[PDB]
Amino acid sequence: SLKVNILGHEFSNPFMNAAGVLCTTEEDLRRMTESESGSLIGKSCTLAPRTGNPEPRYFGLPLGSINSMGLPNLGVDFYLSYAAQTHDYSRKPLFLSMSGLSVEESVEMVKKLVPITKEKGTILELNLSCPNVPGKPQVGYDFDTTRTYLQKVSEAYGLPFGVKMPPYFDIAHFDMAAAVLNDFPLVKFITCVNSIGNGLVIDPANETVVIKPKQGFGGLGGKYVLPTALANVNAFFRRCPDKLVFGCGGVYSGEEAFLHILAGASMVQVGTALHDEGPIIFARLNKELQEIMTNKGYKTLDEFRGRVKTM
Amino acid sequence: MSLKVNILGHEFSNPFMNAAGVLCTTEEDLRRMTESESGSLIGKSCTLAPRTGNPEPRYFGLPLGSINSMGLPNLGVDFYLSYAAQTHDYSRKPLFLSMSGLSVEESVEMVKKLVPITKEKGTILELNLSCPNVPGKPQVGYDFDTTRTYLQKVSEAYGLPFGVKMPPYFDIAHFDMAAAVLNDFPLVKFITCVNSIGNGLVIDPANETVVIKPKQGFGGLGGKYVLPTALANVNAFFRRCPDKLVFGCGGVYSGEEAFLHILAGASMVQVGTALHDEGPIIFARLNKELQEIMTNKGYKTLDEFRGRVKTM
Numbered sequence A: 001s002l003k004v005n006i007l008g009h010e011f012s013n014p015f016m017n018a019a020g021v022l023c024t025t026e027e028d029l030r031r032m033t034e035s036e037s038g039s040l041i042g043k044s045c046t047l048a049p050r051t052g053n054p055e056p057r058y059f060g061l062p063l064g065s066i067n068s069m070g071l072p073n074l075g076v077d078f079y080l081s082y083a084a085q086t087h088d089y090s091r092k093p094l095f096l097s098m099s100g101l102s103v104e105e106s107v108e109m110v111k112k113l114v115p116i117t118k119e120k121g122t123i124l125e126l127n128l129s130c131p132n133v134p135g136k137p138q139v140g141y142d143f144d145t146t147r148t149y150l151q152k153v154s155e156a157y158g159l160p161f162g163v164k165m166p167p168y169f170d171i172a173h174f175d176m177a178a179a180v181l182n183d184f185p186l187v188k189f190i191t192c193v194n195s196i197g198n199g200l201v202i203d204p205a206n207e208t209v210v211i212k213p214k215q216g217f218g219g220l221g222g223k224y225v226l227p228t229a230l231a232n233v234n235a236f237f238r239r240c241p242d243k244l245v246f247g248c249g250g251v252y253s254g255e256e257a258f259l260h261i262l263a264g265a266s267m268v269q270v271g272t273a274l275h276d277e278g279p280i281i282f283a284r285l286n287k288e289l290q291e292i293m294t295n296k297g298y299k300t301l302d303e304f305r306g307r308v309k310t311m
Numbered sequence B: 001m002s003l004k005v006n007i008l009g010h011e012f013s014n015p016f017m018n019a020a021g022v023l024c025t026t027e028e029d030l031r032r033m034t035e036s037e038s039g040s041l042i043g044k045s046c047t048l049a050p051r052t053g054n055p056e057p058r059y060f061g062l063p064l065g066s067i068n069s070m071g072l073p074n075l076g077v078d079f080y081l082s083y084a085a086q087t088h089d090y091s092r093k094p095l096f097l098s099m100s101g102l103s104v105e106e107s108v109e110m111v112k113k114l115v116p117i118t119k120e121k122g123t124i125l126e127l128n129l130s131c132p133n134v135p136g137k138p139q140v141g142y143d144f145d146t147t148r149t150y151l152q153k154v155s156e157a158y159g160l161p162f163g164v165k166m167p168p169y170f171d172i173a174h175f176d177m178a179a180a181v182l183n184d185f186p187l188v189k190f191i192t193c194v195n196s197i198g199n200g201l202v203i204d205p206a207n208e209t210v211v212i213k214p215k216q217g218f219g220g221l222g223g224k225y226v227l228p229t230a231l232a233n234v235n236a237f238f239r240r241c242p243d244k245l246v247f248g249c250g251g252v253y254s255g256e257e258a259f260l261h262i263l264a265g266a267s268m269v270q271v272g273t274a275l276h277d278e279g280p281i282i283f284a285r286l287n288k289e290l291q292e293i294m295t296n297k298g299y300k301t302l303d304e305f306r307g308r309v310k311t312m
């Protein structure tokens, strides 16, 4: 059994898309709904539509991806209408990611979600980590600013929600981040992690960067990020015992999913690998994770979630 | 054709050296680096008193790199100063020493001891603001107020040009903030980008157990994991600190990666994980591979393409 029971919902399996991959348009979301994924999440949205950064803004790499999309999205009203009128909740639960570029914008957006969450059960993931908007640094790397967002969003939304965090690389930062998150009881899950921000890829043949925005600087995903993701998942799993942790980063196989769950993940998100392979990946992921559990004698994910062994 | 680099008052035969921490802890390590084809070498980050470091296992080689939590094992500052003063053959190549005191008071005492040896022998200082593996000691480089303090106290105590080993940054505001601090210290002549990507976690799916013992399995990542991060940091500081040099460190396994670092702005190129895997023979291979790339492109010197990465 791959089932996950959290937030009052039954999820058929722990897999979903990472925000931003296969979730921007109505057709994208249809394809995620029809897939074997246990859930799905809408593109991080803004109050008004955006077309995003200029091209080229995505480059697939042997070890993953680099991107600077720039939050292209159809605007909050599109995703709310999708959540209210279009999505088939009998197939699977639905998350929406919101990434207002100011606390005021984020507050306006979540207020609109309230009635739809109440009526339909739509779940909010507040994005505190977009690394690709020029002039808008990651909110999650300023703990005073993070505290402000969480306060104002908690007050405006007033229902349980989650947060998408940037990756941290210092034990003191894990402690400081957890201290802020633990002051907000409505934050019921933490998604670790967003892209490793502001990497640079250069093509040796033409001596040129591979993406146009920000002088070539963009978010890294895929195989580059697995050990970082696992560390963040485990660090918050241990520091935030009354919250759930969702794993995101470097998942290409059931084995990586198993590691995320062992580190403490309740749901497992798939970005770069899904971009590479398409939504058929979720069928493969379910099969591979089931095999591993079968071979190890695990009847349910609860038997090993967060049970990574240390020396 | 030439791989020569003229910086810091020296002619380096080529841009390659070890990354601090790899093949540089013992006298025997340092001899092997000196005998290698490397353009330079740097001593293990040291502390005022000797350290044996963390318990085993504390290093694990990976298909895409390495994870470690060594814990700053080193023979103590007096050993490296004595190596620099009496043992090192400067006719072979210049010497850097890395210092990583666990408090600013410790660093000040260490750099004061270095002053006369730098004056006499020309030994170069790299101040480590980024060790991610000592429990309870966060990266100084991730606190810009603390960084300003270290740089003020070390500038005042040492009083000669030196460099800094920085942790990797992942946010444009952080590049801006880091550069604003570094640009206030004229004695900071070079910036080495980057130290390990800190506090990664590797788990073996077969036994469900982490692969290193210290810090519940959390350790710094090196190798293929870090190349795009290293290139970004190199280029970000190359642009923001035009009065300083940048050294590249991270993800170098071949002449191709070295070429990319130099294109991004690197004056010297440091090799960590790949050197740990291959041994000091790697430097001969790197020189050959970089020259081959230059030959194919029609470049005669590094100066022809250093910092000339193109954007769109």
Ligand SMILES: Cc1cc2nc3c(=O)[nH]c(=O)nc-3n(C[C@H](O)[C@H](O)[C@H](O)COP(=O)(O)O)c2cc1C
Pocket (backbone or CB within 6 Å): A018, A019, A020, A021, A043, A044, A058, A065, A067, A069, A071, A097, A127, A164, A193, A194, A195, A220, A221, A222, A223, A225, A248, A249, A250, A251, A269, A270, A271, A272, A273, A275
């Ligand atoms: C093309 C692309 C678009 C993305 N857009 C978003 C987004 O809108 N919101 C968000 O929280 N993360 C976004 N990310 C980050 C992913 O959600 C994910 O955190 C990251 O790619 C790491 O997972 P991976 O290793 O599976 O790619 C995006 C990633 C990619 C590659």
Ligand SMILES: Cc1cc2nc3c(=O)[nH]c(=O)nc-3n(C[C@H](O)[C@H](O)[C@H](O)COP(=O)(O)O)c2cc1C
Pocket (backbone or CB within 6 Å): B019, B020, B021, B022, B044, B045, B059, B066, B068, B070, B072, B098, B128, B165, B194, B195, B196, B221, B222, B223, B224, B226, B249, B250, B251, B252, B270, B271, B272, B273, B274, B276
């Ligand atoms: C075994 C080991 C020991 C290290 N010790 C140090 C050290 O003492 N001082 C330091 O500044 N960096 C240290 N590092 C970081 C490396 O100098 C380098 O910044 C990092 O490994 C990235 O380069 P690479 O990708 O070539 O490994 C160490 C790395 C390894 C693998």
